[PDB]
């Protein structure tokens, strides 16, 4: 159980995520110590909101550290889908937090009343965005995007509460506007994660499939091709399965090798081709 | 765009889900009309909570109606994973609503003050639990479970607020207890959905795989078996891929037929077997 911490410290991304989680927890302790007093009306709410943020960060870190685990009998493909699941859960969490921020803005507009804790949170999340930057093999592409979207959403929420404080020297309007903005921002990541989880044909492979089918159909001995299935595994590993109907005397070796080469030139890493010998 | 409503009315499950969504929206209208007054402190919060419930119900209905769509070029396997995604999102939504209910209980305990609207919601959700009961092909197994878990969680929340009302003639304790209870209740569905989305070996197939491998290894001409991959598609369709190394003169037809029969007897519906002829 102790070796998990050292394994986390091995990778730089896990180290940055752990440092971020630790500093968020320290901020949680500071804000709850400040809120022990009677002015905790919105302090409890924003404390629970940043608890949700810490939970999302912990989930992302757990998925990132899990994704490097070796495969076994239970998980033939390994744990490379953990990053996709982390991206999906981060998108859903961002949507739900946008709706929660809209609800909190509505509550603040309805009920008149926190002014300096938001500044500290803005400092924390600007430090976070300063730390985080991006610009089978290599199964780490979505954790950075998810954490970046979450931290930018937190920064925009801090900007919105700062604007509300400036206004009081309407907050629901800016709150709902920023919620819609972050929802639109997270739409592409959510749709990409859904497409990955849908067993959908990879977007970068859809155009090349007709050309590959035409090329393999022209192979000598191949009669018919049927039951194609292509999907992404983690980020780029496209696991494609094919069924071929060849001549009763067709050379299976050459056809299999040519099909494998054709689909490897298209970017399909793992490929499974079944060659069926037609009856007359 | 109009034909979607008739398509929903075609299936009984979609009809029940649509009726439930319509009655939840009617309850939303009634409660907001009641809350237009100055006693909307907790009314806005529970209105947003049941808006979240309506959103989850709409997502479940959309996934259920999508899952019956035919496959195409973009989605080779179709939309049968929509039910698994709906189950996963319902589990995450239930967890987040449990945490939200805990937060609301904390707020109610901290801030002293809604007594009859909860009774109406209890009537609505008991009618819902009365309506809902359960006890490639057939791609509908998780929507009913997800909606049943959500409606039972709503009933338990109504029971908790009723208990709090009885107490006032501690509510945070019962709120957190019921939140933990519903989280534990939703753990099995969440873990099953994660296992489906993890490309994990199906739980009902794990035990039979060693026996199938031993049986296929005993086939004449088969030298080595490598790179096994089995996973569930929607609920029972197990898409398995296999690679075989056979003798240079082994009969590919008989080996392929025997492997297909062996894996079909184990419950693998769609199977892809690649036969490789070893060099000497």
């Amino acid at each position: 159980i102790s070796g998990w911490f050292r394994s986390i410290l091995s990778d730089k991304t896990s180290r940055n995520l752990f440092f971020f989680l630790c500093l968020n927890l320290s901020f949680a302790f500071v804000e709850l110590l400040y809120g022990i007093w009677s002015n905790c009306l919105g302090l409890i709410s924003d404390s629970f909101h940043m608890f949700f943020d810490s939970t999302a960060i912990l989930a992302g870190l757990a998925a990132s550290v899990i994704s490097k685990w070796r495969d076994n009998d239970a998980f033939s493909y390994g744990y490379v889908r953990a990053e996709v699941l982390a991206g999906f859960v981060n998108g859903l969490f961002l949507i739900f937090t946008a709706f929660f921020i809209f609800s909190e803005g509505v509550e603040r507009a309805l009920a008149p009343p926190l002014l300096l804790v938001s500044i500290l949170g803005f400092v924390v999340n600007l430090i976070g965005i300063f730390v985080f930057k991006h610009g089978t093999t290599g199964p780490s592409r979505q954790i950075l995007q998810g954490v970046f979207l979450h931290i930018l959403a937190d920064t925009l929420g801090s900007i919105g509460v700062i604007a509300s404080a400036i206004m009081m020297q309407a907050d629901p309007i800016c709150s709902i506007l920023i919620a819609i903005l972050i929802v639109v921002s997270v739409i592409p990541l959510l749709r990409e994660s859904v497409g990955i989880l849908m067993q959908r044909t990879p977007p970068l492979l859809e155009n090349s499939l007709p050309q590959c089918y035409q090329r393999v159909q022209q192979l000598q001995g191949v009669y018919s091709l049927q039951e194609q299935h292509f999907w992404t595994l983690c980020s780029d590993v496209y696991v494609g399965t094919l069924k071929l109907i060849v001549a009763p005397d067709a050379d299976a070796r050459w056809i299999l090798s040519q099909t494998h080469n054709i689909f490897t030139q298209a970017g399909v890493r793992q490929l499974y081709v079944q060659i069926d010998f037609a009856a007359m | 765009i109009s034909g979607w409503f008739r398509s929903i009315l075609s299936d009984k499950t979609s009809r029940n889900l649509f009726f439930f969504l319509c009655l939840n929206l009617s309850f939303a209208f009634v409660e907001l009309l009641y809350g237009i007054w100055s006693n909307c402190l907790g009314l806005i919060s529970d209105s947003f909570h049941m808006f979240f419930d309506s959103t989850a119900i709409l997502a479940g209905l959309a996934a259920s109606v999508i899952s019956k769509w035919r496959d195409n070029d973009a989605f080779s396997y179709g939309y049968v994973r929509a039910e698994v995604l709906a189950g996963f999102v319902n589990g995450l939504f239930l967890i987040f609503t449990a945490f939200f209910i805990f937060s609301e209980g904390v707020e109610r305990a901290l801030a002293p003050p809604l007594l009859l609207v909860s009774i109406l919601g209890f009537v609505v959700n008991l009618i819902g639990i009365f309506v809902f009961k359960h006890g490639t092909t057939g791609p509908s197994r998780q929507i009913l479970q997800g909606v049943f878990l959500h409606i039972l969680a709503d009933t338990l929340g109504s029971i908790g607020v009723i208990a709090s009302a009885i107490m006032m003639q501690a509510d945070p304790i019962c709120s957190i207890l019921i939140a933990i209870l519903i989280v534990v209740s939703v753990i099995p569905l969440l873990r099953e959905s994660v296992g489906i989305l993890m490309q994990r070996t199906p739980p009902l197939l794990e035990n039979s795989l060693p026996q199938c491998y031993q049986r296929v290894q005993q086939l004449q001409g088969v030298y080595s078996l490598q790179e096994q991959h089995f996973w569930t598609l929607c609920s029972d369709v197990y898409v398995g891929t296999l690679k075989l190394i056979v003798a240079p003169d082994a009969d590919a037809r008989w080996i392929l037929s025997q492997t297909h029969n062996i894996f079909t007897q184990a419950g693998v519906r769609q199977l892809y077997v690649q036969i490789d002829f070893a060099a000497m």
Epitope: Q220, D249, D251, A252, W254, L256, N261, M280 | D276
Partner: antibody, heavy 118, light 112 residues
Framework: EVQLQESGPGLVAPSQSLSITCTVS????????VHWVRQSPGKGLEWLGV???????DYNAAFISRLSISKDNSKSQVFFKMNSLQADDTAIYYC????????????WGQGTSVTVSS | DIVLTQSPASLAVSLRRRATISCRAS??????????MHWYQQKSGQPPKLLIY???NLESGVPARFSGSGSRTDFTLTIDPVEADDAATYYC?????????FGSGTKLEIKR
């Protein structure tokens, strides 16, 4: 006792059509492929085309425009037709049975000397 | 097209000696560890006869004296021992890439 015999005209006028019928025996065309290879003193051996079990055929890139290979499984005969012959098309035309599940040809037949001249 | 070059063009080998014919391909013809190069023997006034398929497997019904190795681009057909009946023209043929191409023939002359 597998045999392949061709029956084609020895002399063909230039810019005419060549018809060669390769009658097979000892095996059925329903499960085997027959290749067509011509040999000339110049350019050496050259591959023309092949016809598969039910009728699918693949032609050489050079001759794809002016080639046509037919087959009739009932009479166990393979029809070979070329259009617009020239001087360099004079060669020895062989019909060869494709090896069992291999890219080579195992059994051949004594080709017919096709000479293109006026 | 894949051009196949056979060296030497003409070879003179004494009886009961060892004969080596090498076929070189412009491009690699290996597919997943399988070499798709085949050897043919054509005597005087006879159709070519298949000897070795896939560059390492003897066709059924040929004498065991014929041996063949090679991989990728360079291949080699070995006759040991060489008999008087082995005086013919040998062709190397590849089936890796459409169209099939036959290399220039190599004439084997028996020294006596």
């Amino acid at each position: 006792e597998v045999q392949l015999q061709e029956s084609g005209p020895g002399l063909v006028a230039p810019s005419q059509s060549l018809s060669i019928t390769c009658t097979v025996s000892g095996f059925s065309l329903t499960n085997y492929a027959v290749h067509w290879v011509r040999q000339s003193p110049g350019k050496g051996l050259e591959w023309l085309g092949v016809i598969w079990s039910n009728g699918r055929t693949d032609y050489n890139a050079a001759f794809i425009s002016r080639l046509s290979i037919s087959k009739d499984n009932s009479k166990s005969q393979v029809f070979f037709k070329m259009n617009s012959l020239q001087a360099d098309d004079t060669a020895i035309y062989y019909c060869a049975r494709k090896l069992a599940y291999e890219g080579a040809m195992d059994y051949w037949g004594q080709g017919t000397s096709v000479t293109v001249s006026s | 097209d894949i051009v196949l070059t056979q060296s030497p063009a003409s070879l003179a080998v004494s009886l009961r000696r060892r004969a080596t014919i090498s076929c070189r391909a412009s491009e690699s013809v290996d597919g997943y560890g399988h070499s798709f190069m085949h050897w043919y023997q054509q005597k005087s006034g006879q159709p070519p006869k298949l000897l070795i398929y896939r560059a390492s497997n003897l066709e059924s019904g040929v004498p065991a004296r014929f041996s063949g190795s090679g991989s990728r681009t360079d291949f080699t057909l070995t006759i040991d021992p060489v008999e008087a009946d082995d005086a013919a023209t040998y062709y190397c043929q590849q089936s890796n890439e459409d169209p099939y191409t036959f290399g220039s023939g190599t004439k084997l002359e028996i020294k006596r």
